[PDB]
Design a binder for this molecule. Structure first.
Ligand SMILES: CC[C@H](C)[C@H]1O[C@]2(CC[C@@H]1C)C[C@@H]1C[C@@H](C/C=C(\C)[C@@H](O[C@H]3C[C@H](OC)[C@@H](O[C@H]4C[C@H](OC)[C@@H](O)[C@H](C)O4)[C@H](C)O3)[C@@H](C)/C=C/C=C3\CO[C@@H]4[C@H](O)C(C)=C[C@@H](C(=O)O1)[C@]34O)O2
Ligand SMILES: CC[C@H](C)[C@H]1O[C@]2(CC[C@@H]1C)C[C@@H]1C[C@@H](C/C=C(\C)[C@@H](O[C@H]3C[C@H](OC)[C@@H](O[C@H]4C[C@H](OC)[C@@H](O)[C@H](C)O4)[C@H](C)O3)[C@@H](C)/C=C/C=C3\CO[C@@H]4[C@H](O)C(C)=C[C@@H](C(=O)O1)[C@]34O)O2
Ligand SMILES: C=C(C)[C@@H]1[C@H]2OC(=O)[C@@H]1[C@]1(O)C[C@H]3O[C@]34C(=O)O[C@H]2[C@]14C
Ligand SMILES: *[C@@H]1O[C@H](CO)[C@@H](O)[C@H](O)[C@H]1NC(C)=O
Lengths: 215, 210, 261, 174, 199, 195, 87
């Protein structure tokens, strides 16, 4: 069986430049050319470029001309990718996908890597600020964990008292700072006659904050 | 420049025959586009299916098959299976580079459909104090897990300032999603009409605010 | 008529150096048909073979369209001498030697269809390198190929595709001019590759040659059995007359060597 | 006429001093074109009767670009094919017994092209093979018989004959 | 012996398109090129086009450029001919004739097929319109229209329908002294009519 | 455009020598016309005879032979036979296609000749009522099977009878108002006419 | 575009016979890459061998610069027939 194992996740500040790897095994490494794909949260899949291990030859997407630099180390069967002048826009998951044909370009994808998650942010460990979400003047309430870093943050309701109807949504990366929100559904008439406190914890900064919902 | 277009999402039952399509904006998808089809299982598992001239990746099941139906590339799964439920990206080759589509979220049905529960939250007073105003729109308990969030301030639809999270799976096999429209405290008082309309599998649900 | 149609095409600003335009800016698609005439001199020492074929290229050049819909004009016009036309600078990557035939008049044909479709036909004699594998030498099969690709134009400018119907054809008198082998199978494939100068489109035709056995049966196997069998007829000579035995065993052995050499 | 030789593998025009061509334009507009050409043509041969065989070799002639609506070839009405007197004398190994002049017009994918075909018939000379193959082999087989006249006790002599003639037989064939 | 067996007769409506076949046997099919000839009642023999089995190559008569499409199936040794946008004018008998030379064009005809009769018509069943005709021995006539001495002549094609007459010579002493009538039946229309020949 | 012309019909006895000719309208029939000759027996039986340069179909009898007598193509049957009675089409090659002739109906005599029995019928009153008048000129008992009707006309093809004398009918179509006449048949000599 | 870029380079006074200019008057530096395709017929009697290779030369000719910084124009232009260049 063939395998493409990529380097681990990386956190780097803007302006810097890091290099992710893709170690191939289970096939004659120098026979299949490698593609690099960028999956960002903001856009679709983008094709960065490709490199022929045997040849050293490269061809980049005009978009990434100067942003990425594909290289290859024949001895260790590893394909590398440099990323220069890293910025907020470079925060994405970078995959490496093999081409299908043996010692020739077939223009079709075989196997991909598990992907490498690159996070680019000039942020320091920053405790979140919890703002309550009440319904405009079965009712739904929510918390807004806004402007924290890095992940993760956990959210409960009444210290676990209510679990049914609890949904903690994914976070979004805005302004170098993450931000999510968690909702909890209860029968309209019970609120606000019952304490509805949400429990937010940011272990990365030892932060623990309670903020009960109120109209 | 050149854009690739795919169905937002499709539904099918185990055993049936579903067909995904891939459209080119510059014209008809020809053989020199080398239409590729890629599958993404949950947890970021990508694998190739079809591509090139008429070749396929190693191990790609026989039920998968490519063609040029009409004037766009097609990917036909004859006898859909449970595991076939994933996100399918198609990629076209334009001269010297690849361009991917938006992807199609194929659902192999395992439970009854469920329309989304939409809620719109006005900016907290505690937050307005910091000259910032965040509209939060929550969407829960929907299936199949594909929606389309759209904001509109004072009748007019918004293009920027909006952020929508990707359909996350719930403990009960249904999906959820959140969307934030960002404004300034001075700009949140400047208006009085806000809309967060969520489309799901045809039809639409809207939650306004004033 | 025809001379006038040609004059109309080149009286305007036409540059044979400029690649034909495309609707979406895509590459020029060149369909290729190939007709093998003769496959000869299959050298096993230098691992190469000679072959004479007719190359047939077809692409679209809207600039050259004269009749468009036509239906009032001639379907196509034969391109006469003195009129330059952009052409795919195709070459044979594995060619070691090549000759165009120019006897009397050069052996080429160019047609310009009303819609701008161009047909290009040319006779070419090649000497191609064909790495051979003699593991089963006497009873082996070799696979020889003709590669075809653009030299200067990359994948954004020119793309080759085998004609949809019968891309490779053989002249009827091909197998008869090939006595030593038997052309059992042919294939038509792509060999596009990514180099240091870019990604170049490439076609590859492949013939499969099966070595004729009749010769080796008569010139190697039969005579060796006949030689080994002779070495046995000495088992029937009395053990006292050893000179006879040695003469047989030794002569057959020496001859065995010679034959092998 | 952009004529070429369909079965030519190699061709040379003679250009020594001045190119060897002649063009005449008769008053009525009739054109005569004459040119010396050296060819190397492919001629599939059949060796079923190798030693005593006859082969038929041909020269094909046709237009390359012009189809049947534009150009049509016809062999001259009188003596279309002629031989120089010193042809058979420069051809020692064979004997040019018969010649023929025919048409080979064919329908291709690019159209229907007019075509002529001249054919010479070559009969392999036998004198060589009589002296270098048959005679010496009889002489070799006959030698193997002179061992039937040696006493059955002197078997070394017999073997030496039978074996030597056999080996030699091999060599000759090789 | 060689043979060219063509498909059976066909009846098709105008606008449609049908395809007739010509199965060759008794010779190396791929060695001889095939011609297609159209014999219509209105005109002479017309040459449609020709195809080289081995080559796939085709050459059409300018007249039938777009009307006919010659193809060939090597495996089954069969030559086909498509006819598009069929009309009244396409009603004819289509033959397929082999060329004479072996793996080359000789421009001379060998064997033909038995022919295929193609009828392209758009008229439904219609009852025969019988009209009597009349001027030793007197000859009487009977005329069918738009459908001893018993002479029924061939049937023409007048305005997309048929029309024939019927002579019948008899001694003059049996007319009009005796009733001369003619029976006109038509199985497809189920109509039988009689017309009395009067002087 | 270019048209090919042949004798309408010819007659000959068993053993004699008959010659069919094929004329080109553009000029003299040259070798690049590749004059072809085809035979059509009754019941739609076609077979090639001569063609190409000077080659012939397989089995074509020795009595058949081609030539370029004068400035047109000829087909000469030396020693005509009974079975040789058929319709002969000649075809010329003009640049890139074939053009056939009208064909020649060669008759090898077997039964004494016979004059055509003609009879001209007027249009009945049932027709004049339909507003469409039709004439009928039946031709019975004649040999050989070659007649030429001469009066909107449409004559039928010769067809043998029970006594082996081909028969035919002619139809002159008109309108009732036009109606408000004579048919002449020329047969291998004299001309029978009736009004 | 490309045809225009080429026209702009040779419409001025350009001499393919003249060596490309240098900043310090130094020599023209030609970088060489070499790709061996086949090495055959290794004759030991005449002590020689045949080989087919792809020669790749690269030098700088400021006279031919059209885009300079470019970043608005195509990176490079394929030189078409009929345009002489010092080599
Ligand atoms: C028979 C082998 C033993 C060892 C005998 O060898 C000898 C004498 C001692 C043994 C008894 C000597 C040998 C000849 C044979 C006798 C053979 C023949 C008279 C002919 O062939 C036979 C057999 C042959 O089928 C083996 C058969 O063809 C069939 C079957 C084949 O498939 C199995 C198939 O392909 C074919 C199409 O149809 C054939 C019809 O008939 C004759 C054709 C043989 C000629 C042999 C030779 C000619 O020049 C060769 C060479 O230049 C040399 C130096 C030695 C010769 C030799 O080797 O001489 C030689 O190779 O006897
Ligand atoms: C005679 C054969 C038996 C086996 C004898 O062989 C040997 C000795 C043992 C046997 C008795 C050995 C043999 C020679 C002969 C003797 C032959 C001659 C002295 C000459 O020829 C004779 C006969 C010849 O007609 C057969 C005749 O020409 C006539 C008739 C011909 O038509 C029937 C016709 O074409 C011709 C035009 O006019 C001629 C005038 O005169 C001499 C010409 C022979 C030379 C032979 C050879 C020369 O190099 C050959 C080869 O490189 C080799 C290795 C062996 C030689 C050989 O084979 O040597 C060889 O083939 O005797
Ligand atoms: C038996 C003997 C001694 C003979 C003698 O002469 C022969 O031909 C016989 C032979 O066996 C065969 C050959 O090997 C030998 C040789 O050349 O001389 C000798 C050898 C040994
Ligand atoms: C030719 O035919 C054989 C049949 O087994 C097949 O294996 C081979 O792939 C074919 N293609 C080529 C290269 O000739």
């Amino acid at each position: 069986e063939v395998q493409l194992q990529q380097s681990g996740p990386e956190l780097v500040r803007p302006g810097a430049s890091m290099k992710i790897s893709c170690k191939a095994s289970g096939y004659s490494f120098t026979g299949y050319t490698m593609n690099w794909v960028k999956q960002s949260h903001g856009k679709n899949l983008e094709w960065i470029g490709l490199i022929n291990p045997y040849n050293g030859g490269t061809s980049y997407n005009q978009k990434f001309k100067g942003k990425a630099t594909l290289t290859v180390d024949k001895s260790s069967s590893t394909a590398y990718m440099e990323l220069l002048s890293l910025t907020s826009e470079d925060s994405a998951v970078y995959y490496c996908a093999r081409d299908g044909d043996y010692y020739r370009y077939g223009r079709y994808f075989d196997y991909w890597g598990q992907g490498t998650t690159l996070t680019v942010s000039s942020a320091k460990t920053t405790p979140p600020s919890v703002y309550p979400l009440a319904p405009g003047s079965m009712v739904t309430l929510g918390c807004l964990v806004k402007g924290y870093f890095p992940e993760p943050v956990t959210v409960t309701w009444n210290s676990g008292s209510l679990s049914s109807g609890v949904h903690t949504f994914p976070a979004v990366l805005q302004s170098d700072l993450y931000t999510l929100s968690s909702s909890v559904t209860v029968p309209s008439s019970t609120w606000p006659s019952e304490t509805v406190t949400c429990n937010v914890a940011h272990p990365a900064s030892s932060t623990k904050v309670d903020k009960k919902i109120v109209p | 420049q050149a854009v690739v277009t795919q169905e937002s999402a499709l539904t099918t039952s185990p055993g049936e025959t579903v067909t995904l399509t891939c459209r080119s904006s510059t014209g008809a998808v020809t053989t020199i586009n080398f239409a590729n089809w890629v599958q993404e299982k949950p947890d970021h598992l990508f694998t190739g299916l079809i591509g090139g001239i008429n070749n396929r990746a190693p191990g790609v099941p026989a039920r998968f098959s490519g063609s040029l139906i009409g004037d766009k590339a097609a990917l036909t799964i004859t006898g859909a299976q449970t595991e076939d439920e994933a996100i399918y990206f198609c990629a076209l080759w334009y001269s010297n580079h690849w361009v991917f589509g938006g992807g199609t979220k194929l659902t192999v049905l395992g439970q009854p459909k469920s329309s989304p529960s939409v809620t719109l939250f006005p900016p907290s007073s505690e937050e307005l104090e910091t000259n910032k105003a965040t509209l939060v729109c929550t969407i829960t308990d929907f299936y199949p897990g594909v929606v389309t969030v759209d904001w509109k301030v004072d009748g007019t639809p918004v293009t920027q300032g909006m952020e929508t999270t990707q359909p996350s799976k719930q403990s009960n096999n249904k999906y959820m999603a959140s969307s934030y429209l960002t404004l300034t405290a001075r700009a949140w008082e400047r208006h009085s009409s806000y809309s967060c309309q969520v489309t799901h599998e045809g039809h639409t649900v809207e939650k306004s605010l004033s | 008529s025809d001379s006038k149609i040609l004059a109309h095409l080149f009286t305007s600003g036409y540059d044979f150096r400029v690649r034909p335009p495309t609707d979406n800016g895509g590459p020029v698609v060149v369909s290729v048909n190939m007709l093998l005439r003769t496959i000869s001199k299959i050298d096993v020492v230098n691992m190469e073979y000679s072959a004479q074929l007719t190359l047939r290229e077809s692409w679209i050049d809207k600039r050259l369209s004269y009749g468009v819909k036509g239906d009032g004009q001639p379907d196509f016009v034969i391109l006469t001498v003195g009129h330059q036309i952009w052409m795919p600078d195709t070459f044979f990557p594995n060619e070691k030697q090549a000759y165009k035939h120019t006897i009397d008049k050069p052996n080429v044909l160019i047609r310009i269809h009303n819609d701008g479709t161009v047909l290009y036909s040319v006779r070419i004699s090649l000497v191609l390198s064909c790495p051979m594998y003699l593991q089963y030498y006497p009873m082996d099969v070799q696979q020889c190929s003709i590669d075809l690709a653009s030299y200067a134009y990359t994948t954004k400018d020119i793309e080759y595709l085998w004609k949809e119907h019968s891309p490779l054809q053989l002249k009827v008198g091909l197998s008869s001019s090939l006595p030593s082998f038997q052309l059992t199978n042919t294939s038509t494939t792509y060999c596009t590759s990514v180099t240091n100068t870019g990604i170049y489109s490439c076609l590859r035709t492949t013939i499969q040659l099966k070595r004729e056995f009749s010769f080796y049966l008569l010139q190697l196997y039969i005579p060796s059995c006949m030689l080994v069998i002779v070495s046995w007829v000495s088992f029937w000579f009395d053990r006292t007359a050893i000179p006879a035995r040695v003469t047989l065993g030794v002569t057959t052995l020496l001859t065995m060597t010679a034959q092998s050499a």
